[PDB]
Amino acid sequence: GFTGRKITSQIFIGPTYYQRLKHMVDDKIHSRARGPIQILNRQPMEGR
DNA sequence: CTGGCCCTCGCTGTCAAAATTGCGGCTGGGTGTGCGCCCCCACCCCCTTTTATAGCCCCCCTTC
C-alpha cells in the first residue's frame, strides 16, 4: 500500500468469520496517583 | 565367700494412630445478605349498671 510495489510472496486472502469480544481496552485501562485509601490498612483501594 | 539359673520388674525401641498446616499470581465483572420452656410477679382490662345516639348484623319468624 505504501509504495505500490508488488509484494514478492503471494498472500493468502479471503473471507473469514471474525467476532469481536467483550474484552475492550477502554474497560481495562487504569491508573492511579494518590487516590482514596481503605479503612483498616490505610492502603490503596482494590479495583479499577 | 563364690558361681549357675529363672523370676519380677524397669526401661527401651518400635509401631501405630490422632492431630496439624498449606495447597500460584494478577485482573475484571455481577449479585446477594444481615433462643426456648415453664414458672412467678406487677400492672391493666373487663366483668357490671346507667342512658342517649344510629348503622350494622345475628337470630327467629313468616311467607310462599
What single-letter DSSP state applies at residue A44? Answer: B
Q: Compute the C-alpha angle A5/A11/A12, nearest 5°.
A: 160
| C-alpha distances in Å from residue A4, one per residue of A1, A11, A14, A15, A18 | 5, 15, 21, 23, 28
Q: How far is CA A48 from CA A17, A23, A27, A34, in A?
A: 33, 15, 9, 14
Distances (CA, A) of A22 to A19, A28, A29, A31, A48: 10, 11, 14, 21, 17
> Which residues make Cβ contacts (< 8 Å) with residue A12, sequence separation at least 6?
none
Backbone angles phi, psi at A37, to 5 degrees: -120, 145
Q: How distant is C1' of B21 from CA of A41, in Å?
A: 27
A35 CB neighbours strand B below 7 A: no
Say yes or no: Cβ of A46 under 7 A from any atom of strand B: yes
Q: Which residues pair with A42 in a beta bridge?
A: none
